[PDB]
Design a protein around this ligand. Structure first.
Ligand SMILES: O=C1NS(=O)(=O)c2cc(-n3cc(CO[C@@H]4O[C@@H](CO)[C@@H](O)[C@H](O)[C@H]4O)nn3)ccc21
Ligand SMILES: [Zn+2]
Length: 258
């Protein structure tokens, strides 16, 4: 019935309800680093998160997300390949059952343990619902997670997950600073793509950072304790909620760095 990541409702099934699944600019993709072209005309990314207002954290049955106040230019992404101003709406993660899988984008076929998506929408379209219907409506900042040392800025997130174990649970999650999730370098790859979950709309300028962040085994283990199911249903652990790499087709990935 509903789409998911299982054998009978996973990514290979999605095209039946969402035919754009087989479209011309689908995400994620493998980033072949030796084929990506350095584009000296790409500006540095501008990440302005100082006034970010987080609101809530929610288990939505496919991942968990932290949502922000996007009614004002408080946490915005600009520059890079983007024209105009993109407001941060939410961030969420994709992760695996094991450390060797979980990311959606891959780098020379390498899978990371997880991938962070910070979802922004173009203010010129007024609301995110309008923006998803535009070819340049969204900008998603993708950040790889590898397992090693802990990420201190992630800990406030993992500590509240026990309160949103099952689908539909939400909790107050104020005063969270997403700057604590960023790597040192803002070097990136960029390409035109799509949402990686239904409706798979082709509305995203992808900005994928070259430098992963490191998270600890205990931190990622807490991700894996979440549930796909709702309270009172048979427990199915929320793991491997990633879409695999899709055909690049007629696209060139650009790099901001040599
Ligand atoms: O996991 C996938 N990886 S992804 O490609 O980065 C992505 C983007 C989205 N987006 C959903 C939306 C529309 O937002 C809706 O309405 C607003 C109302 O405040 C949101 O609170 C709420 O996130 C969602 O219900 N824009 N992007 C959903 C899932 C993934
Ligand atoms: Zn995502």
């Amino acid at each position: 019935h509903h789409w998911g990541y299982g054998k009978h409702n996973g990514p290979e099934h999605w095209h039946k309800d969402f035919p754009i699944a087989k479209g011309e600019r689908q995400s994620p993709v493998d980033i072949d680093t030796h084929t990506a072209k350095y584009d000296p005309s790409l500006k540095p990314l501008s990440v302005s998160y100082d006034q970010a207002t987080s609101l809530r954290i929610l288990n939505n049955g496919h991942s968990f997300q932290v949502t922000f106040d996007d009614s004002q230019d408080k946490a915005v992404l600009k520059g890079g390949p983007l024209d105009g101003t993109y407001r941060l709406l939410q961030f969420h993660f994709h992760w695996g059952s094991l450390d060797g899988q979980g990311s959606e984008h891959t780098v020379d076929k390498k899978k990371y343990a997880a991938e962070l998506h910070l979802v922004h929408w173009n203010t010129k379209y007024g609301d995110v619902g309008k923006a998803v219907q535009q070819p340049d409506g969204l900008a998603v900042l993708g950040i790889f997670l590898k397992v090693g040392s802990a990420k201190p800025g992630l800990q406030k997130v993992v500590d509240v997950l026990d309160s949103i174990k099952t689908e539909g649970k939400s909790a107050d999650f104020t005063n969270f600073d997403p700057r604590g999730l960023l790597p040192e370098s803002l070097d990136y790859w960029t390409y035109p793509g799509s949402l990686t979950t239904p409706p798979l709309a082709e509305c995203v300028t992808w900005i994928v950072l070259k430098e992963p962040i490191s998270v600890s085994s205990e931190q990622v283990l807490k991700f894996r304790k979440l549930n796909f199911n709702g309270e009172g249903e048979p427990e199915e652990l929320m793991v491997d909620n990633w879409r695999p790499a899709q055909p690049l087709k007629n696209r060139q990935i650009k790099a901001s760095f040599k």
